[PDB]
Amino acid sequence: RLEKLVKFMDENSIDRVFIAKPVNVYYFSGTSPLGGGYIIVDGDEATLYVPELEYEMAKEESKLPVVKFKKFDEIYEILKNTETLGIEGTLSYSMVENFKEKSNVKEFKKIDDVIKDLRIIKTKEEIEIIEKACEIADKAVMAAIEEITEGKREREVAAKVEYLMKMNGAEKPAFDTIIASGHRSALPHGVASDKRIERGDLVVIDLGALYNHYNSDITRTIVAQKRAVEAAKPGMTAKELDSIAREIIKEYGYGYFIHSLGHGVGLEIHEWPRIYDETVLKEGMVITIEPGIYGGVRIEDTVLITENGAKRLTKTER
């Protein structure tokens, strides 16, 4: 929503805004050019700037007016003498310095707050896409379980599962597929390796699908989470949600629960909010719920916050 961006620009005294992060360029333009895409909001509205190699593709996809540049150096001329330039916190130091030296920009203000507030609430159209990515992720996890046998390498299972996801319409995996067996299960971010699975080992299967620009996330462990999903009644804070699962684990005597309970999922695999965080959970928010004890066990579902509750978008047996 560009209307909310302009409204943010108005009450923070920002003249022009520059957006360069591919995910945010998509969110506001409807297209994401691989070789570079850049939005400038000049007061009232926005336009998409692309290199000539991306012009044709951006033209058929963008809801915004598209103009091509031969040199990136052209953008410094259009933003010349901007008093306050609204930028993403992720914008590189190089680019900031270039705006100061070549465009004579006088001050910079972080536009992160409005992008966070916009992207944190997913529309019905966004939820439909995420549900489809979750369906692909469901199929992939089931395929992984059927493929895990004696002597099989973690990476080989990962490859077949990622092949399955793409054959089912996913652009690519949402992240490096985690398949961790034996002592590797004790590691949370244990990306699949050359190590061979033996009988009696705990195999943590963690994967996601990127489908039509939206992500999914699922973890199953083969050889506490239910209560957290059941408790998420909007109006609740993110910390209070984390408290539920962490309390059960602490009550059993494993309070090993080293990472957070979850994270937001959308155009990126890890986004707002985190489940230290005290954001008020609202309907339309798409989050992850993943408790773990580290031997290693992790159970994770992508969950949608609905009116008076939360529902699982990933549907695989726990």
Contact positions toward a second copy, by CB under 8 A? 33-35, 51-57, 71, 87-94, 96-97, 108, 110, 112, 155-156, 158-160, 162-163, 166-167, 169, 171-172, 176, 186-191, 194, 258-259, 276, 294
Q: Which two tokens stand for residue 251?
A: 């009550």
Per the CB < 8 A criterion, the answer to whether 205 and 181 are in contact is no
Residue 285's SS3 state is coil
Of a second copy, Zn ion, none, which one sits near residue 233, judging by CB under 5 to 8 A according to partner kind? Answer: none
Closer residue to a second copy, CB minimum distance, 190 or 266: 190
- Residue-level length of the chain: 318
> Is 217 known as a binding-site position?
yes
Of Zn ion, a second copy, none, which one sits near residue 288, judging by CB under 5 to 8 A according to partner kind? Answer: Zn ion
Residue 105's SS3 state is coil
Closer residue to a second copy, CB minimum distance, 69 or 312: 69
Binding flag, residue 154, Zn ion (CB under 5 A): no
Of a second copy, Zn ion, none, which one sits near residue 117, judging by CB under 5 to 8 A according to partner kind? Answer: none
Of a second copy, Zn ion, none, which one sits near residue 172, judging by CB under 5 to 8 A according to partner kind? Answer: a second copy
- Which candidate, 299, 275, 306, 313, places its Cα nearest to that of 129? 313
> Is 10 known as a binding-site position?
no
CB of 52 to a second copy, least distance (A): 5
Closer residue to a second copy, CB minimum distance, 164 or 244: 164
Closer residue to a second copy, CB minimum distance, 15 or 88: 88
Position of tokens 């992984």? Answer: 144
Of Zn ion, a second copy, none, which one sits near residue 206, judging by CB under 5 to 8 A according to partner kind? Answer: Zn ion
Q: Omega into 234 within 30° of 0, i.e. cis?
A: no
| CA dist., res. 86 & res. 174, Å (int) | 29
Per the CB < 8 A criterion, the answer to whether 209 and 140 are in contact is yes
CB of 181 to a second copy, least distance (A): 14
- Which candidate, 24, 178, 162, places its Cα nearest to that of 86? 24
CB of 303 to Zn ion, least distance (A): 11
> Is 135 known as a binding-site position?
no
| CA dist., res. 30 & res. 9, Å (int) | 21
CB of 158 to a second copy, least distance (A): 7
Q: 112-119 vs 2-11: helix axis angle to the nearest 10?
A: 150
Per the CB < 8 A criterion, the answer to whether 269 and 174 are in contact is yes
CB of 230 to a second copy, least distance (A): 25
| CA dist., res. 215 & res. 175, Å (int) | 9
Query: One symbol per residue from 198 to 227: x for binding Zn ion (CB under 5 A), - otherwise; what is it?
Result: --------x----------x-x--------
Q: Which of residues 276-295 bind Zn ion (CB under 5 A)?
A: 288
Query: Strand order in 16-19's β-sheet?
Result: 66-69, 45-51, 38-42, 16-19, 84-87, 107-110
Closer residue to a second copy, CB minimum distance, 138 or 290: 290
Cα four-point dihedral sign 11, 15, 21, 25: positive
Which residues belong to the annotated binding site for Co(2+)?
206, 217, 263, 290, 300
Q: Residue numbers of the site for Zn ion (CB under 5 A)? A: 206, 217, 219, 288, 300
